[PDB]
Every structure is written in structure tokens, then in C-alpha cells.
DNA sequence: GCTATATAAGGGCA
DNA sequence: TGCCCTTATATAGC
């Protein structure tokens, strides 16, 4: 699909974070007692942690009725898993709705299949880069348009994060592609 | 396991 | 105020 992805590479979506408002106060201890695949340690974190096999995800359910869903490989899968959780809560006795579902972070990654001269890339783009190999082996590239953060490795492996729309993930990778090429390690 | 990245939700505390 | 708490996930040298 060289028309949409000129580099001929499509970043793989790895993790999606979403939120939804169940729109009802939830008794968390009641839920932690009735729910099987759930864990709740208020002294550690103020949320019940639930999980489902398909789509493989984890939800953080708060007393406020708010809910975080993480782990899905796509946006649809995240909405889908979010709905299965809402229905679990519904079946637990709370008048749970599904208000304001929103994708909050999309995580993707790809392999350009060639090593990068991270120091040169960093040096040529100081304004956007943070490369301190002794702290983290990857170059932290904070792209301005779109506002996306890329983790660039010597191996040619790239992690694109911070997107709320998958096109931001694709766009960021397309913008960075010619840059990675410019600093290919020979 | 850790280091780092983005992100939401909450309680708790300087 | 504002930071960390926790969860997921790719990446990789500790």
C-alpha cells in the first residue's frame, strides 16, 4: 500500500489505552468480593484491577464509575473489551452505562531493518532528541507535528507512542523514515 | 526486574 | 499544587 505508506512499512499497533465513564458510582469492595478475575488493594491503588482473555486487556475500575482499559492491539478491540467490562459490572448489579469512550494513547512499533547512527541523529536534531545511552539505549525523539514521541534504537527497531489516532502513528513514522535513512549505520 | 516513552483514572501526601 | 501511586506495551542495555 505504497500510496498510504510510502516507506512501504506500516507500524504495528501494540497497545491501546482507553477510558470510558460507566456513569454510576461503584462499590469497589462489593465488586472485589463478587468478581472473580479481579484484585483490589486500596492501600496500593484506588481501583479494582480486572482482566479478560479476549480481547486480552486489563481494566482499572474506579469507585467514580470511571474506567481505564489497556492492552488491546487495536482501537476497536479496546472499545470491545471496554464494553465487556461494563457488562460485567452491569451483571454485578450496578446500572453501568458506556459514556464518553475515548482512545487516550496508541502504542506502535516497527523495524526499518537497518541500524541507526543514533549519536549523529541526535547531534543533527538536538532540538527534538534526548540520547543518553548510559540511561536508556534508545534515542528519545519528541516530534512536534504530530506531537508524537519515538524511541529509536540502533537495531532499527522503532517505538511510536502518544498517538490518539492511528494516523498520527503512521504519519510520525513516515516523517521520521527519511531521517533514519540519512543516519543509517554502514 | 530495571532504565525511558506515552496515557488515563484515584488516593495520598508534602 | 503536583507528583507518585497502577496498568499495558513495544524497544534494549543493564
UniProtKB/Swiss-Prot annotation:
Classification via InterPro entries: TBP, TBP_CS, TBP_dom_sf, TBP_eukaryotic
UniProt keyword annotation of Cell division present: no
Sequence repeats: 13-89, 103-180
GO CC field: nucleus
The keyword Nucleus is assigned to this record: yes
GO-annotated biological processes: DNA-templated transcription initiation
Subcellular location: Nucleus
Keywords tagged on the record: Acetylation, Activator, DNA-binding, Nucleus, Repeat, Transcription, Transcription regulation
MF term (GO), any: DNA binding
Main location: nucleus
Superkingdom, natural source: Eukaryota
Subunit annotation: Belongs to the TFIID complex together with the TBP-associated factors (TAFs). Binds DNA as monomer. Interacts with TAF1 (via N-terminus). Interacts with MEE12/CCG1. Associates with PWP2 in the nucleus. Component of a nuclear protein complex containing at least TATA binding proteins (TBPs, e.g. TBP1 and TBP2) and ATX1.
Protein purpose: General transcription factor that functions at the core of the DNA-binding multiprotein factor TFIID. Binding of TFIID to the TATA box is the initial transcriptional step of the pre-initiation complex (PIC), playing a role in the activation of eukaryotic genes transcribed by RNA polymerase II.
Family: Belongs to the TBP family.
Name used for this protein in its record: TATA-box-binding protein 1
Organism: Arabidopsis thaliana
Amino acid at each position: 500500500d505504497l500510496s498510504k505508506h510510502p516507506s512501504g512499512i506500516v507500524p504495528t499497533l501494540q497497545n491501546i489505552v482507553s477510558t470510558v465513564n460507566l456513569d454510576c458510582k461503584l462499590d469497589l469492595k462489593a465488586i472485589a468480593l463478587q468478581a472473580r478475575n479481579a484484585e483490589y488493594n486500596p492501600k496500593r491503588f484506588a481501583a479494582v484491577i480486572m482482566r479478560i482473555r479476549e480481547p486480552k486487556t486489563t481494566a482499572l475500575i474506579f469507585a467514580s464509575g470511571k474506567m481505564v482499559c489497556t492492552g488491546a492491539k487495536s482501537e476497536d478491540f479496546s472499545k470491545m473489551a471496554a464494553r465487556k467490562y461494563a457488562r460485567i459490572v452491569q451483571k454485578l448489579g450496578f446500572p453501568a452505562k458506556f459514556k464518553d469512550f475515548k482512545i487516550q494513547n496508541i502504542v506502535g512499533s516497527c523495524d526499518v531493518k537497518f541500524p541507526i547512527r543514533l549519536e549523529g541523529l541526535a547531534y543533527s536534531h538536538a532540538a527534538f532528541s534526548s540520547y543518553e545511552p548510559e540511561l536508556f539505549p534508545g534515542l528519545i525523539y519528541r516530534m512536534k507535528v504530530p506531537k508524537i514521541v519515538l524511541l529509536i534504537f540502533v537495531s532499527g527497531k522503532i517505538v511510536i507512542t502518544g498517538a490518539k489516532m492511528r494516523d498520527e502513528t503512521y504519519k510520525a513514522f513516515e516523517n521520521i523514515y527519511p531521517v533514519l535513512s540519512e543516519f543509517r549505520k554502514i
